[PDB]
Amino acid sequence: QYFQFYGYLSQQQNMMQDYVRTGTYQRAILQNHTDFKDKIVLDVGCGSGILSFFAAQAGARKIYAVEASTMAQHAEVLVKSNNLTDRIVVIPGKVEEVSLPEQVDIIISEPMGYMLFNERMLESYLHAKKYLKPSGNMFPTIGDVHLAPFTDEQLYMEQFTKANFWYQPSFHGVDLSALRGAAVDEYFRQPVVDTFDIRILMAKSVKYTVNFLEAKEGDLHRIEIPFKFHMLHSGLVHGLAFWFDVAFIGSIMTVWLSTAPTEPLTHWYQVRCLFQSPLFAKAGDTLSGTCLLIANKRQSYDISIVAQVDQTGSKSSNLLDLKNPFFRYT
Amino acid sequence: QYFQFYGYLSQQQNMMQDYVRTGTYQRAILQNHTDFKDKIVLDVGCGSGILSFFAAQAGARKIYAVEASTMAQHAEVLVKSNNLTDRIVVIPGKVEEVSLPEQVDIIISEPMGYMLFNERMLESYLHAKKYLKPSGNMFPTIGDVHLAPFTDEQLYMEQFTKANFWYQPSFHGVDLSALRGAAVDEYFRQPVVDTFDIRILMAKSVKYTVNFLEAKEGDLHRIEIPFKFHMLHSGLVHGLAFWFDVAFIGSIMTVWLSTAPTEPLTHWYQVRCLFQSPLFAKAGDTLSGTCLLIANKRQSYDISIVAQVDQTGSKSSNLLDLKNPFFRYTGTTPSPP
Ligand SMILES: COc1ccc(CCNC(=O)[C@H](N)CC[C@H](CNCc2ccccc2)C[C@H]2O[C@@H](n3cnc4c(N)ncnc43)[C@H](O)[C@@H]2O)cc1
Ligand SMILES: COc1ccc(CCNC(=O)[C@H](N)CC[C@H](CNCc2ccccc2)C[C@H]2O[C@@H](n3cnc4c(N)ncnc43)[C@H](O)[C@@H]2O)cc1
Structure with a gap:
């Protein structure tokens, strides 16, 4: 039921066309481009892949984009159509269950629900810190x-x-x-x-x-x-x-x-x-x-x-x- | 999730306060009192038990009210409150999985979804005809x-x-x-x-x-x-x-x-x-x-x-x-x- 809902492009569209959300994330990433340039990134629950695209714009060397819903298929389409196959690697699955080939410099995600904690996605975000290098950062912090x-x-x-x-x-x-x-x-x-x-x-x-x-x-x-x-x-x-x-x-x-x-x-x-x-x-x-x-x-x-x-x-x-x-x- | 939804009194209330539902069912039952008087009834997915209360108003001898969500607990409270424990028996569970002690004269339910069939509850309604006497009736028919x-x-x-x-x-x-x-x-x-x-x-x-x-x-x-x-x-x-x-x-x-x-x-x-x-x-x-x-x-x-x-x-x-x-x-x- 949960990951079925997120398999719909309409739900991803609804989140993306929210400009305060999307625009603020892009500003956070691009205005801190030295936190991304030549770095390794993990995007937790990437959906369409939009935050991974921002990380790529900011010069990330490699971005692992983890997505548990069938939206992973659609993210793969966009990575290919945006000629970013060498830079964004979609990894289909739950971030708790997938395998990543290396540790990352920074984790990015949009895990907030009502009252911050609703949906319990922050647990997956914090779980992902098993992949974070000792010097590493998280966005949001x-x-x-x-x-x-x-x-x-x-x-x-x-x-x-x-x-x-x-x-x-x-x-x-x-x-x-x-x-x-x-x-x-x-x-x-x-x-x-x-x-x-x-x-x-x-x-x-x-x-x-x-x-x-x-x-x-x-x-x-x-x-x-x-x-x-x-x-x-x-x-x-x-x-x-x-x-x-x-x-x-x-x-x-x-x-x-x-x-x-x-x-x-x-x-x-x-x-x-x-x-x-x-x-x-x-x-x-x-x-x-x-x-x-x-x-x-x-x-x-x-x-x-x-x-x-x-x-x-x-x-x-x-x-x-x-x-x-x-x-x-x- | 499905039966969890139906465990909320607010959801049941939304359907009860829908007069075209509740009013129409009450009229159908009370205007056909000879279908219910001294008869044995099965109420499939009774929720609060409202239709079972209407069957009792029409003089039913015994109503088996089957409800798969935790709303069955609340239905039981209402049956007691309304002093009808001798006539309405609330059976918690799916109509596919419970046992009735006898066959029934009439089955009543509100199993309709969008385009009639959505939610697939009509399959439970038809399943329940294993308990229907040969010449029994169903409401809706x-x-x-x-x-x-x-x-x-x-x-x-x-x-x-x-x-x-x-x-x-x-x-x-x-x-x-x-x-x-x-x-x-x-x-x-x-x-x-x-x-x-x-x-x-x-x-x-x-x-x-x-x-x-x-x-x-x-x-x-x-x-x-x-x-x-x-x-x-x-x-x-x-x-x-x-x-x-x-x-x-x-x-x-x-x-x-x-x-x-x-x-x-x-x-x-x-x-x-x-x-x-x-x-x-x-x-x-x-x-x-x-x-x-x-x-x-x-x-x-x-x-x-x-x-x-x-x-x-x-x-x-x-x-x-x-x-x-x-x-x-x-x-x-x-x-x-
Ligand atoms: C009416 O329309 C509606 C549309 C959507 C919604 C639900 C809104 N929920 C949120 O906003 C939460 N913050 C989750 C956002 C992220 C996606 N973030 C992408 C993004 C980022 C910035 C700007 C725009 C978009 C979910 C993805 O996370 C995935 N996911 C969740 N948990 C996991 C997990 N453990 N592992 C992998 N993927 C996961 C899930 O499948 C998803 O695809 C309600 C109504
Ligand atoms: C915004 O508020 C909302 C509120 C409700 C809904 C869902 C609407 N669905 C319907 O109207 C369907 N017709 C199902 C109605 C019946 C209850 N009918 C009660 C009634 C009758 C007449 C007049 C008023 C009210 C469901 C019960 O059926 C139960 N149920 C379903 N399948 C089974 C089953 N197999 N066995 C037992 N119980 C079952 C379920 O737990 C339930 O409690 C959506 C939004």
């Missing part, structure tokens, strides 16, 4: 997850209205209300994928940094993000908002790709995790807690968010089912 | 697939607008043009899910009927639908449009559920299969051929459509995969020619 409390009564009421379907004592004569609790729980486990006005954010964001040069694959099985927010506005906190930046830390310059709500909307949007019960906080209070992401079998995460207003002891404990997001953007 | 040729130049030219992304010699310095043919082929292989104005239809529909009381499970592995269309309008034929009706043929009356474009829009919409090579036909011409649906491993079908204009010999041959439909519906009022 780091990822910063940002979280901030938000207020959005409308979104809270939207989701509660849907759940309240299961409150009905006589839906076509049938009592559904035994499932009231189960339904509220399920709906509030859905992360909400869309954008929002920055004025709904009630505190400055807290940053959690993953350094891909240092992180191990296994580390992403359990991700613990501590936070302490200094509330800038009084009101109800309906949940936490999440976004991410990645940096390409090259030898010439650092280039950033941001999905922040202060930046042009991207196809990652932003993600919000709702509280079943909103918390009241006053400006000046502190909202503290821990976001715990636990990896599961569906290439996703079970998220635990516990947040408390320190001054009052008002606490919210919450689950998020990242397998089952609500795509709200209209 | 019959399904009618309708097909008609259409003209839609704008839909046709969208496929090339999208594919021609690849016809660029320097997309960020890369020549993409070698993949344009593959892209065209992929887009044309996607059946288009959306609605349309009936005035784009160029001939009266042809109807293919499956009688679920007589059909066998294997009949649905290879479905051959011949057609001969007598053109009412002159123009370019860009493909075939598909929709379906099912009938609940009770002892008291027949109730229809229709997804036709002459009827209020449903969540099945309609489905259009484009010809990558469109056919010129004039009013009075005959457009003949064959739509072959070949079951595949992804709970879907490979679709082969071959059509020719008899008077000119002009021919169009097309392969689609119903596992990769394009959901085109936006909401904007459909345009006539």
Whole structure:
């Protein structure tokens, strides 16, 4: 199912024609061309091969382009039609299972999902470091997850209205209300994928940094993000908002790709995790807690968010089912 | 993944709050109460159990409600809550793998997908007739697939607008043009899910009927639908449009559920299969051929459509995969020619 989806040219097209994504990667690579010139490159999950082409433009001597879907066949076609057979070598397969003939100077990939970690492709990216030379680099080099409390009564009421379907004592004569609790729980486990006005954010964001040069694959099985927010506005906190930046830390310059709500909307949007019960906080209070992401079998995460207003002891404990997001953007 | 999807209350709710589903089924069952009163019922893929509750409202003695996803746990909670444990038995599992303690008088289900057959659940519905008494009934009893040729130049030219992304010699310095043919082929292989104005239809529909009381499970592995269309309008034929009706043929009356474009829009919409090579036909011409649906491993079908204009010999041959439909519906009022 997963690699079947990526076998479609339409999905590769959709990612490629996203200019912030494609254009930022090309700038990161070309403006750091000394990190590529005459070097050996591994492209993890190359799709059409676009990043491998950028590495070749920047003067890479040899690029191993690993792709697990049938899109590998299409990448091979483009390498031949662009006369790059001596420079880009497609290796069909999962990066965990293929054989490479030598170690590489730099690994490149676009492994980011919703909230950075969704899809769990960063595990494959970090796995690939078995091929990285000791002096070696990775593009992207780091990822910063940002979280901030938000207020959005409308979104809270939207989701509660849907759940309240299961409150009905006589839906076509049938009592559904035994499932009231189960339904509220399920709906509030859905992360909400869309954008929002920055004025709904009630505190400055807290940053959690993953350094891909240092992180191990296994580390992403359990991700613990501590936070302490200094509330800038009084009101109800309906949940936490999440976004991410990645940096390409090259030898010439650092280039950033941001999905922040202060930046042009991207196809990652932003993600919000709702509280079943909103918390009241006053400006000046502190909202503290821990976001715990636990990896599961569906290439996703079970998220635990516990947040408390320190001054009052008002606490919210919450689950998020990242397998089952609500795509709200209209 | 398939049964995991159905374990969400939100998904089941989406189908329950669809009134053309839930309302039509309730009417079909309650208006045919003599088909259910003191009878034994099998509910195939019951989800929340809603149809089983309707069978009980109609006075069924015993309902075996079979559900393969974890929604069966929630159905059990509802059966208890509604004090019907003596009359509805929730059996967790696939209808192909469970055991019933007796044969049943009637089987009820909502197994319809896009173009009727998508999702392949009708095979489970027909499989369940191993439990049906000799003269038992099935609700739905019959399904009618309708097909008609259409003209839609704008839909046709969208496929090339999208594919021609690849016809660029320097997309960020890369020549993409070698993949344009593959892209065209992929887009044309996607059946288009959306609605349309009936005035784009160029001939009266042809109807293919499956009688679920007589059909066998294997009949649905290879479905051959011949057609001969007598053109009412002159123009370019860009493909075939598909929709379906099912009938609940009770002892008291027949109730229809229709997804036709002459009827209020449903969540099945309609489905259009484009010809990558469109056919010129004039009013009075005959457009003949064959739509072959070949079951595949992804709970879907490979679709082969071959059509020719008899008077000119002009021919169009097309392969689609119903596992990769394009959901085109936006909401904007459909345009006539
Ligand atoms: C509506 O249209 C849609 C289109 C696409 C999507 C999914 C979007 N997902 C992402 O953006 C993720 N970041 C993954 C991106 C990369 C491809 N990156 C290529 C790229 C880079 C820069 C600019 C443009 C494009 C996936 C490839 O990774 C492959 N892959 C994943 N895991 C592995 C693995 N372990 N080994 C090998 N290949 C793998 C997978 O088959 C693929 O082909 C959703 C909707
Ligand atoms: C955006 O929201 C969405 C929500 C749902 C969908 C999928 C739509 N599919 C259909 O409508 C198909 N007709 C299948 C409907 C039936 C349920 N019918 C319940 C009903 C009946 C009348 C009125 C309202 C509701 C599926 C159950 O069938 C189960 N099932 C499928 N195959 C089997 C099987 N072999 N054995 C047992 N259960 C099975 C499956 O687990 C399920 O729970 C897509 C999008």
